[PDB]
Amino acid sequence: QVQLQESGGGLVQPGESLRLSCAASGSISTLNVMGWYRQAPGKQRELVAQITLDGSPEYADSVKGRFTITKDGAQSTLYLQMNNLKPEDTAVYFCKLENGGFFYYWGQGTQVTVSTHHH
Amino acid sequence: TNLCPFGEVFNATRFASVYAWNRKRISNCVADYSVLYNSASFSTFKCYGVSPTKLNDLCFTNVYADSFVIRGDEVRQIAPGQTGKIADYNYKLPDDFTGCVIAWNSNNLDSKVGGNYNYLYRLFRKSNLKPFERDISTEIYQAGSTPCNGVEGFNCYFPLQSYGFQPTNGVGYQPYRVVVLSFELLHAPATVCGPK
Ligand SMILES: *[C@@H]1O[C@H](CO[C@@H]2O[C@@H](C)[C@@H](O)[C@@H](O)[C@@H]2O)[C@@H](O[C@@H]2O[C@H](CO)[C@@H](O[C@@H]3O[C@H](CO)[C@@H](O)[C@H](O)[C@@H]3O)[C@H](O)[C@H]2NC(C)=O)[C@H](O)[C@H]1NC(C)=O
């Protein structure tokens, strides 16, 4: 009934930038909250960034000032712009959608790996 | 400003036993009730005093979601003026009830091979519950005329017993998750509203 697909995961060097995308589809209410979450292995899922109902973005302390979250209304896509990546940002990244206040949904996740390339 | 937190009920991993039904109070938030009924996920969706498709157009002082698990063929007791050990001794709805009763088969979550015995109901009580009353006491019931004085005996019985849910049970004895939404409009400001 509501589906979420993350895209843009991959390999990145520390200090580089990367943008992730969450295409949402299905029967989405006008009242919904979307967010980005991540999970490093052995650690628990952690809020990364979300946009409140009133529109104002919020950020986890570990990414505040380095990540930007924006919501493309037309193309129902939630964007996470990730700057100055560090090795600690390596994780599986997930979007969430809380629909109408009654259900919430998760994507499958996409892997972001921050590692130095070997030339 | 905020989304109502009903997903903490409808996506909950575990529900309460019917004797100790959970009440969650909802206030200062907005909600799209279209999302409930357009899911089509609920095999019991009956509303009293209100109309599902008009709920987005109203505001209420509070909304209370009561949640609990019962057995399939006790679902019919969650309605104004019913009798039976669920309506009498565990969860009673008023005759002037204003709200919606929602239910769905949770055999896939609440049944286990071998039998899940974690869900409990009250089998014995000296009197019926009053509407929206909640009795969690575990004092030995007296089915005879002898103070059981805190121990089970002849005609003296522990007041709770287990459902026992297995996947191969018949639907009448499969677990159902129930949510009863109550809508309250007092003289105070109504903070709970729909997309408007
Ligand atoms: C939060 O809850 C919703 C609603 O789930 C449904 O209703 C509840 C009352 C329970 O009865 C649930 O058991 C029941 O599934 C969850 O959304 C549901 O998710 C499932 C699986 O992701 C979806 O299943 C799909 O259904 C289609 C249509 O038949 C199939 O073709 C697919 O193969 C697939 O199985 C289901 O459509 C979906 N329902 C709705 C209304 O969206 C939701 O996943 C859950 N959230 C979490 C985090 O668990």
Residue A42 lies in a domain: yes
Q: Which of A35, A33, A30, A53 is closest to A45 using CA atoms?
A: A35
The overall longest dimension of chain A from CA atoms, in Å, is: 50
Rounded to the nearest angstrom, the distance between the alpha carbon of B82 and the centre of ligand 1 is: 32
Coil vs helix vs strand at B85: helix
Q: Identify the domain containing residue A91 by its residue range.
A: 2-114
Report residue B163 as tokens: 């459902």
Q: Which of B51, B59, B9, B54 is closest to B29 using CA atoms?
A: B59
Residue A19 lies in a domain: yes
Q: Which residue type sits at A58? A: E
Q: How far apart are CA B66 and CA B120, in angstroms?
A: 16
Q: How far apart are CA A93 and CA B11, in angstroms?
A: 21
CB contact under 8 A, A101 and B34: no
CB proximity list for B117: less than 8 A, separation 6 or greater = B162, B163, B164
Rounded to the nearest angstrom, the distance between the alpha carbon of B18 and the centre of ligand 1 is: 24
Residue A49 lies in a domain: yes
Q: How far apart are CA B194 and CA B3, in angstroms?
A: 10
B81 touches chain A (CB under 8 A): no
Helix spans in B60-190 (H): 85-89, 107-110
Q: How far apart are CA A37 and CA B118, in angstroms?
A: 33
Residue A64 lies in a domain: yes
Coil vs helix vs strand at B7: helix
Residue A79 lies in a domain: yes
What is the experimental resolution, given in Å to one decimal place?
2.4
Q: What is the CB-side half-sphere exposure of residue A45 using CA atoms within 13 A?
A: 12
Instruction: Report the relative pairing of strands A67-72 and B22-26 from DSSP bridges.
Output: unpaired
Q: How far apart are CA A28 and CA B168, in angstroms?
A: 36
Residue A119 lies in a domain: no
Output phi, psi for B131, to 5 deg. -55, 125
Q: How far apart are CA A99 and CA B3, in angstroms?
A: 9
A76 φψ region: left (φ > 0), alpha (ψ -120 to 50), beta (else): left
Place of tokens 């639907």: B171
Residue A81 lies in a domain: yes
Q: How far apart are CA B153 and CA B121, in angstroms?
A: 20
Is residue A29 within 8 Å of A99, Cβ to Cβ? yes
In CATH, what number is assigned to the domain containing residue A14? 2.60.40.10
Give the DSSP per-residue string, A52-119.
-TTS-EEE-TTTTTTEEEEEETTTTEEEEEE-S--GGG-EEEEEEEEETTTEEEE---EEEEE-----
Ligand 1, atom nearest to B7 Cα: 1
Q: Is the CB of B104 under 6 A from ligand 1?
A: yes
CB contact under 8 A, A54 and B7: no
Report residue B140 as tokens: 């030995």
Q: Which residue type sits at B41? A: S
Tally of domains within chain A: 1
